[model samples]
Target: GNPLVYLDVDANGKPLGRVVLELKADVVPKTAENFRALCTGEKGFGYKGSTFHRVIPSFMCQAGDFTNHNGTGGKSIYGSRFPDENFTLKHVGPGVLSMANAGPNTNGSQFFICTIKTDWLDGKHVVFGHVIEGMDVVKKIESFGSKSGRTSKKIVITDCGQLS
Candidate 1:
């Protein structure tokens, strides 16, 4: 399958940067399908102008909620939850993209790209993809802090397309 390209942008639509996430197709087929549907314009646009509202230094960063324009009041309005397609990809270090879930089989359209090592999250969060490029941008965004103690930064995936 093709890799999912995520463009991290600001509110004004400026191209802050981009991150290319390579999916582990053999390990997480269903998870990859969900991501592919968004990237290839099948499941509709994925997180275009969505905010990266959660971040923690030396820990992890999370985003992809669609509510309140902030971290609160967001939920997966589109796509139903899918069964847990548990994979072997470990959250060993930074740039690891993994699915975000509330509980088992509750993953819809939310995922996170780590900014630091997160071995504790291994096997708990389904590791489906990894950032092939742009770790500096990830760390840059993680530096911003939210009022609620979570690192909140507005990042928009302006466009996602297959690379030739």
Candidate 2:
């Protein structure tokens, strides 16, 4: 079985709901572990209160840049940024959770949840997880984004944790 984690989301200062993610540790252990620990905040920093800076309709919602809260800053549990663990997993459809990077091998705390199947990102972005629950919540956040990647309102992860 895979590890389950959750993100309690909020938009415009109101609670939206919980978005549960299942990390495919069986396929990408290293990649999964990074997101797991960050959720737990055992390292003194985590995704709590982080803004989903970029959200696009029929695309994806990007977040976890806790430091800057605007898709510019965040570090992994290992350090500033870590190398791409593997691309063994595929971005086959919506709800796919993937690492957001700068070009290649520049993965950090940033990640994205796909709203639609994105085949172009396959083999380039590492996919390590998916939303096991709350697809509706993810879509609600998606409503806040524009074509320019600018969100009209703040959509944030109010809390996060491991669900075992």
Candidate 3:
């Protein structure tokens, strides 16, 4: 009851629904801890009001860049870049939550939730969590994506808190 995060995202004018995610601290400890700190606003830095800046249909929706709001800025709990956790988790299917990075060993606050099969991402990104509930809502978010893939209306994480 400590690491699981219940993430709630909403449309520009409505509540989408709740998505339960199991943050895998066991497989990717450092990366998971970094996410936990960000989710809980540890030291006042959680993902409140964060925008889903990149949303590609049949692909993934990326956000959590609390610094830039354009998917170009964010930081880790360690206050700077950190080494990769070298996790073995794979992107299996839709609704999979994964860490987004600039490249290897540059993990920070940015992350993404897959909306389709992404097996190609196997070793490139560390898998941190996945959806346990609310796949419909994930699909709902996926529907609003565009050519630029950014939601015309900012898809926002309305609220987030510990669920387990």
Error of 2 at 16 (Å): 0.6
Q: How do all models score by TM-score?
A: 0.81, 0.98, 0.93
Better of 2 and 3 by lDDT: 2
TM-score of 3: 0.93
Cα error of candidate 3 at position 28, Å: 0.6
**Candidate 1 lDDT by residue in tens digits, 113-149:** 8877788877678998888877777777667645353
Q: State the C-alpha lDDT per candidate.
A: 0.68, 0.92, 0.83
Candidate 1 off by > 4 Å: 1-4, 11-14, 67-78, 146-153
CA lDDT, candidate 2, residue 43? 89
Most TM-score-accurate candidate: 2
- The residue pairs that clash in candidate 1, if any, are none
* Candidate 3 clashing pairs, residues 3+ apart or interchain: 1-164, 2-164, 41-46
* Candidate 3 lDDT by residue in tens digits, 16-67: 9987888888888888888877777866886888878888888988888888
Cα-based RMSD of candidate 3: 1.5
Which digits, one per residue and each the tens of the lDDT, describe model 2 over residues 31-127? Answer: 8999999998988999998899988888999999999988889999888888887888888888999999998889999999999999999989999
